[PDB]
Amino acid sequence: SKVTTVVATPGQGPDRPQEVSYTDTKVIGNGSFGVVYQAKLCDSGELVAIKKVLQGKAFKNRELQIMRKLDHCNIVRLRYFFYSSGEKKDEVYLNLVLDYVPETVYRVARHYSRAKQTLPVIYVKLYMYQLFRSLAYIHSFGICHRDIKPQNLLLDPDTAVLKLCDFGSAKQLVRGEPNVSYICSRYYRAPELIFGATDYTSSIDVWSAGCVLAELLLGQPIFPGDSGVDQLVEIIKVLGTPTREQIREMNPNYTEFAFPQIKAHPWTKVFRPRTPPEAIALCSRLLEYTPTARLTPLEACAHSFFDELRDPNVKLPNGRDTPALFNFTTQELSSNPPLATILIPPHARI
Amino acid sequence: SKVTTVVATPGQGPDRPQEVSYTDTKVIGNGSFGVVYQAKLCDSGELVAIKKVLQGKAFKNRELQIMRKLDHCNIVRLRYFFYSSGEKKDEVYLNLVLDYVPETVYRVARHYSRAKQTLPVIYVKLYMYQLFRSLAYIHSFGICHRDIKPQNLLLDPDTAVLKLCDFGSAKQLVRGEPNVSYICSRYYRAPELIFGATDYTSSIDVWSAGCVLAELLLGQPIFPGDSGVDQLVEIIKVLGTPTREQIREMNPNYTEFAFPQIKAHPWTKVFRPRTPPEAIALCSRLLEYTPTARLTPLEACAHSFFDELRDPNVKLPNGRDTPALFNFTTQELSSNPPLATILIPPHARIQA
């Protein structure tokens, strides 16, 4: 087996390059910006994913700069990163050595869906809570993921730990500075994004997250559609007709809105009868037309829907303990410290 | 069998209501704005599709007003249309009785695709040419379809006639008046649409049509992507990097463009080796960043790629004759009359 050895720079640590060797290199994906391999570190034996991307050198790689600044248990970590010339024109490739995670919320959900079933609520709670923590964290740095979707939520079957990945669309959102409106995937795009808003905030991720939650409860996407129109129609069916005010807060000067006057047929009418009221309540507070009205990732973590996770005797179906869910840092709570009162249960520690 | 009878107003004829009876009503679709049925007219026995849509009366139905103004053999015709109260709040429903067509370019393409094959070029020519005529036609009225895609191209297996359908997104585009940028489906959205342009023209349909042509030649969508970003990346791989100028003609003040400097790996490198050079040429002239640089639907019909259709001895594979492809009207040629010189073959000018 071919053993590759390179000199890579640690992810978070000091910028002191080390020698890294890996074997069993195989292609496990072919993304937009490049190919993604899967190798095994000769030392620890651990599995990792290598994402190669064309680097122009004419600029600083935005994804790399964001990844180096992140250190959270619910975020895929950049172990190392190095460069390597390619071909076709002797190009410079940036290789990102990320941790390898088995499943994804996408694959898991599909398993249950095409099995005529729904993911047990315990897992819906565990997964969503971790997604909101990772979101609370990156937002505190002013970083917006801009592409939250089931495929980017890596999962570990045994530990039930969820990690956000794919920061290729992430960006530091600065007030007053324009942001492109063509990011984020289909069923998960927030209304303001569909309306071409260029001055949106991190609240777009919260909407995306609300779409994932809803999808986990329904068994299929809540707002399907091949065009923004079809998507807008599905949203209106559930949320009702956007008031002149709401349409203005979503920004886009589309105050000249041409759509039927359909009022909302309540959320309790959207999900199955067994669906927990709190779960439905959370969606309603997450999927709001007015971006400033949506819960903040931190406020969602403290939502009554996640109270079971704060229960001392909570356990995973497989008998194991839940991952660390209360080891919040000052940085994570910064958007609203007083919330620690709820986020951290009386028994929690770490 | 339940026989329904209603008083419907003819499609284009004088607004003189008539009694229409139909049976065998079954649901054949459940679209965004409503359900689509399929019934059989008791008289002629012909099959039709009824599209019900919620009508607020507070306005004039835009789709209906456009459909009534259209009469082309490559455009689905509105036979009748009537109203009927529904429920849930005693709503008023607008029923559009359109002609019923069997297959769609979408279904046909999928048949070949998941059969490890490609649709014979003869069919690609016949289908694209008719799509460009229908496009040349509605564009002459200033109407932009805004949602051209394989699913909206109805086909008739035997006659090889293609008809454009679904005008629910169509609109009269007036210069200086803003148009929403959230129309058109995923793989077929033109660059300016992805960039959020609000002052686009009918050239967006030409782009969409170029994507259908390329898809018929490749066996799959040419510019896939679940996000505008992913789509933009696929387009850039083929067209290269948009110049500051092109990015400005697409409009959106995104002159501050943040994307790699990838040059284009030629179109001949995109399609299979057997792909006709003319076919590839047409795509290159259809899929342009600058919307004003793209061929017009009428100019495409006159493209060398369609020369076989103008051949006197052209015939369909099943031995039948090709549909009428040269009976152009003044209205259709209005964008450039001199083109009739090519559009109408010498043998089509033989008075006899």
XYZ file of C-alpha atoms in Angstrom, chain B:
352
model
C -69.741 7.270 -15.723
C -70.402 10.774 -14.332
C -70.923 13.209 -17.201
C -70.111 16.789 -16.236
C -71.628 19.636 -18.226
C -70.555 23.270 -17.975
C -70.833 26.551 -19.860
C -67.363 27.481 -21.029
C -65.995 30.412 -23.022
C -63.918 29.460 -26.100
C -60.154 30.002 -25.975
C -59.380 32.459 -28.751
C -62.723 32.676 -30.561
C -65.345 35.397 -29.771
C -66.385 35.531 -26.104
C -69.553 33.528 -26.862
C -70.047 30.818 -24.173
C -70.865 27.248 -25.180
C -72.100 24.111 -23.478
C -69.339 21.582 -22.871
C -69.718 18.046 -21.514
C -66.908 15.733 -20.463
C -66.466 12.403 -18.709
C -63.774 10.097 -17.274
C -62.419 12.835 -15.018
C -59.249 11.650 -13.275
C -56.406 13.427 -11.482
C -53.213 13.385 -13.546
C -51.234 15.912 -11.586
C -51.161 18.100 -8.532
C -49.317 21.317 -9.317
C -48.328 24.254 -7.109
C -51.332 26.433 -7.887
C -53.830 23.587 -8.295
C -54.912 20.156 -9.474
C -54.836 19.032 -13.091
C -57.450 16.592 -14.337
C -57.864 14.637 -17.541
C -61.309 14.239 -19.037
C -62.871 13.149 -22.306
C -65.161 15.498 -24.234
C -68.461 13.649 -24.778
C -68.771 15.058 -28.307
C -65.446 14.806 -30.196
C -64.276 12.179 -27.721
C -60.904 13.984 -27.668
C -58.856 14.047 -24.459
C -58.203 17.277 -22.584
C -56.558 18.468 -19.418
C -58.346 20.695 -16.927
C -56.140 22.897 -14.745
C -57.956 24.302 -11.703
C -56.486 27.347 -9.991
C -57.632 29.519 -7.104
C -58.929 32.816 -8.528
C -59.127 35.785 -6.170
C -61.256 37.985 -8.448
C -59.379 40.919 -6.882
C -57.252 40.727 -10.044
C -57.179 39.452 -13.639
C -55.613 36.013 -14.098
C -52.308 36.661 -15.909
C -51.949 33.126 -17.284
C -55.435 33.263 -18.785
C -54.882 36.639 -20.451
C -51.717 35.341 -22.113
C -53.243 32.010 -23.178
C -56.145 33.756 -24.924
C -53.750 35.879 -26.938
C -51.911 32.810 -28.307
C -52.580 30.667 -31.369
C -49.601 28.599 -32.540
C -49.220 24.968 -33.530
C -46.210 24.607 -31.214
C -48.023 26.002 -28.190
C -50.607 24.133 -26.147
C -53.989 25.616 -26.949
C -56.618 26.756 -24.492
C -59.795 25.110 -25.785
C -62.173 26.573 -23.191
C -62.146 28.047 -19.695
C -64.805 28.459 -17.022
C -65.308 29.105 -13.321
C -66.586 26.913 -10.487
C -66.813 27.542 -6.759
C -64.731 25.213 -4.602
C -64.748 25.024 -0.811
C -62.713 25.523 2.394
C -64.017 29.107 2.232
C -66.239 29.030 -0.882
C -63.473 30.040 -3.270
C -63.750 30.756 -7.000
C -61.817 28.320 -9.188
C -60.587 29.122 -12.701
C -60.600 26.001 -14.886
C -58.413 26.008 -18.016
C -59.362 23.314 -20.521
C -56.151 22.682 -22.426
C -55.321 20.039 -25.005
C -53.955 16.790 -23.573
C -50.552 15.646 -24.828
C -49.153 12.124 -24.054
C -45.384 12.441 -23.501
C -42.975 15.239 -22.575
C -39.403 15.889 -23.591
C -38.590 15.103 -19.941
C -40.059 11.591 -19.980
C -38.606 10.782 -23.391
C -35.120 11.954 -22.406
C -35.295 9.906 -19.195
C -36.290 6.792 -21.160
C -33.105 6.998 -23.213
C -30.916 8.158 -20.358
C -31.708 5.276 -18.047
C -31.235 2.980 -21.013
C -27.663 4.055 -21.555
C -28.560 5.860 -24.777
C -29.092 9.217 -26.428
C -32.079 10.471 -28.365
C -31.426 10.369 -32.157
C -30.195 13.764 -33.431
C -33.119 13.881 -35.859
C -35.467 14.146 -32.871
C -33.174 16.635 -31.154
C -33.432 18.860 -34.266
C -37.189 18.472 -34.614
C -37.825 19.189 -30.936
C -35.443 22.128 -30.593
C -36.581 23.775 -33.814
C -40.203 23.698 -32.753
C -39.266 25.038 -29.325
C -37.471 27.991 -30.956
C -40.494 28.739 -33.142
C -42.814 28.813 -30.168
C -40.229 31.020 -28.483
C -39.927 33.314 -31.536
C -43.719 33.550 -31.479
C -44.458 34.433 -27.856
C -41.414 36.715 -27.782
C -42.789 38.762 -30.689
C -45.675 39.645 -28.341
C -43.187 40.651 -25.668
C -44.139 37.580 -23.605
C -41.379 35.653 -21.816
C -42.161 32.102 -20.669
C -39.704 32.294 -17.761
C -39.806 28.554 -17.030
C -38.644 26.602 -20.078
C -37.653 23.066 -19.032
C -38.064 19.494 -20.398
C -41.218 18.940 -18.296
C -42.994 21.852 -20.041
C -42.316 20.569 -23.528
C -45.223 18.311 -24.512
C -44.631 15.775 -27.282
C -46.681 13.560 -29.566
C -44.825 10.286 -30.326
C -46.382 9.702 -33.751
C -46.386 13.185 -35.301
C -43.210 14.405 -33.565
C -44.973 17.711 -32.843
C -43.792 19.622 -29.798
C -45.912 22.095 -27.850
C -44.803 24.490 -25.107
C -47.000 24.370 -21.985
C -47.362 25.766 -18.477
C -47.573 29.554 -18.803
C -48.036 30.039 -15.067
C -44.744 31.961 -14.879
C -45.104 33.818 -18.192
C -45.227 37.598 -18.254
C -45.289 40.556 -20.655
C -41.815 42.073 -20.107
C -41.870 45.841 -20.361
C -38.606 47.810 -20.532
C -37.942 49.786 -17.377
C -40.325 47.668 -15.300
C -38.790 45.328 -12.662
C -39.302 41.564 -12.880
C -38.897 39.062 -10.013
C -35.704 36.997 -10.177
C -37.029 33.932 -8.418
C -38.662 32.331 -11.493
C -37.370 29.524 -13.732
C -36.263 26.060 -12.560
C -32.893 24.993 -11.162
C -30.722 23.597 -13.950
C -32.231 25.962 -16.508
C -31.811 29.354 -14.816
C -29.743 31.833 -16.829
C -26.661 33.476 -15.187
C -28.363 36.850 -14.728
C -31.177 35.048 -12.884
C -28.689 33.401 -10.486
C -27.097 36.813 -9.937
C -30.518 38.168 -8.957
C -30.947 40.430 -11.993
C -34.228 42.250 -11.924
C -34.095 43.802 -15.405
C -33.622 40.700 -17.551
C -35.103 40.236 -21.010
C -36.556 37.393 -23.033
C -33.036 36.174 -23.684
C -33.374 34.171 -20.433
C -35.670 31.740 -22.307
C -33.023 31.317 -24.997
C -30.545 30.322 -22.277
C -33.065 27.843 -20.872
C -33.570 26.374 -24.330
C -29.805 26.072 -24.776
C -29.739 24.027 -21.562
C -32.416 21.703 -22.917
C -30.525 21.205 -26.184
C -27.279 20.483 -24.394
C -29.142 18.073 -22.095
C -30.561 16.174 -25.052
C -27.057 15.810 -26.496
C -25.344 14.872 -23.218
C -27.876 12.579 -21.593
C -28.030 14.639 -18.423
C -28.291 18.270 -17.272
C -25.316 20.337 -18.329
C -25.359 22.726 -15.336
C -26.486 20.749 -12.229
C -26.386 22.211 -8.745
C -28.544 22.461 -5.664
C -27.352 25.983 -5.006
C -26.723 28.952 -7.260
C -23.085 28.558 -6.298
C -22.843 24.957 -7.474
C -24.640 25.921 -10.692
C -22.369 28.909 -11.202
C -19.362 26.596 -10.815
C -20.592 24.221 -13.529
C -21.281 27.111 -15.924
C -17.862 28.633 -15.302
C -16.185 25.258 -15.989
C -17.629 25.337 -19.498
C -17.845 29.016 -20.359
C -14.765 30.165 -18.480
C -14.471 33.163 -16.180
C -16.949 36.039 -16.737
C -15.130 39.246 -17.696
C -15.814 42.367 -15.617
C -17.804 43.505 -18.644
C -19.908 40.342 -19.013
C -20.658 40.347 -15.280
C -21.943 43.885 -15.786
C -24.145 43.042 -18.772
C -25.754 40.237 -16.746
C -26.417 43.325 -14.616
C -26.362 42.597 -10.837
C -23.753 44.960 -9.374
C -21.730 41.882 -8.419
C -18.730 43.421 -10.207
C -17.160 42.359 -6.902
C -17.105 38.752 -8.136
C -15.420 36.178 -5.866
C -14.745 33.044 -7.926
C -11.623 31.148 -9.155
C -9.999 32.107 -12.505
C -11.033 29.006 -14.477
C -10.704 29.279 -18.267
C -13.041 27.292 -20.535
C -12.233 23.738 -21.623
C -13.851 23.969 -25.112
C -17.303 22.762 -25.954
C -15.982 19.946 -28.195
C -14.573 18.571 -24.920
C -18.062 18.644 -23.361
C -20.059 16.388 -25.683
C -19.484 12.856 -26.984
C -17.162 12.400 -30.016
C -20.061 11.639 -32.388
C -21.815 14.919 -31.479
C -22.389 17.004 -34.653
C -20.220 20.136 -34.798
C -23.241 22.302 -35.661
C -25.029 21.104 -32.528
C -22.108 22.199 -30.380
C -21.883 25.509 -32.247
C -25.543 26.266 -31.488
C -24.983 25.688 -27.767
C -22.015 28.009 -27.715
C -24.164 30.753 -29.356
C -27.096 30.057 -27.046
C -25.202 29.706 -23.748
C -23.517 33.120 -23.521
C -22.896 35.257 -20.431
C -23.916 38.398 -22.240
C -27.660 38.130 -22.671
C -27.677 40.386 -25.765
C -25.086 38.159 -27.457
C -27.305 35.076 -27.434
C -29.057 34.120 -30.666
C -32.718 35.081 -30.882
C -35.214 32.275 -31.156
C -35.676 33.125 -34.827
C -31.942 33.196 -35.511
C -31.590 29.757 -33.957
C -34.225 28.247 -36.265
C -32.087 29.467 -39.152
C -28.982 27.877 -37.671
C -27.091 25.330 -39.796
C -27.817 22.682 -37.156
C -31.383 22.578 -38.488
C -30.484 22.340 -42.188
C -31.591 18.692 -42.345
C -35.130 19.790 -41.498
C -35.143 22.019 -44.562
C -34.147 19.078 -46.757
C -36.970 18.136 -49.183
C -36.571 14.424 -48.468
C -36.549 14.737 -44.700
C -38.763 12.154 -43.010
C -39.387 10.866 -39.490
C -37.871 7.522 -38.440
C -41.354 5.944 -38.434
C -41.613 6.886 -42.116
C -44.120 9.732 -41.645
C -43.661 13.326 -42.790
C -42.245 16.003 -40.511
C -44.769 18.454 -39.020
C -45.281 21.788 -40.807
C -42.057 23.682 -40.054
C -42.131 26.523 -42.547
C -45.607 28.014 -42.370
C -44.227 31.173 -40.700
C -46.518 34.205 -40.137
C -45.680 37.905 -40.367
C -45.994 38.011 -36.590
C -43.347 35.267 -36.187
C -40.839 36.838 -38.538
C -41.411 40.366 -37.260
C -38.155 40.355 -35.276
C -36.175 39.967 -38.533
C -38.177 39.399 -41.792
C -35.080 38.934 -44.015
C -34.565 35.601 -42.259
C -37.568 34.147 -44.120
C -34.990 33.705 -46.892
C -33.605 30.742 -44.956
C -36.496 29.786 -42.720
C -38.631 29.012 -45.784
C -36.845 26.520 -48.108
C -36.861 26.935 -51.901
C -39.097 23.857 -52.205
C -41.580 25.430 -49.795
C -42.036 28.318 -52.221
C -43.265 26.123 -55.079
C -46.842 27.371 -55.620
C -47.970 24.409 -57.793
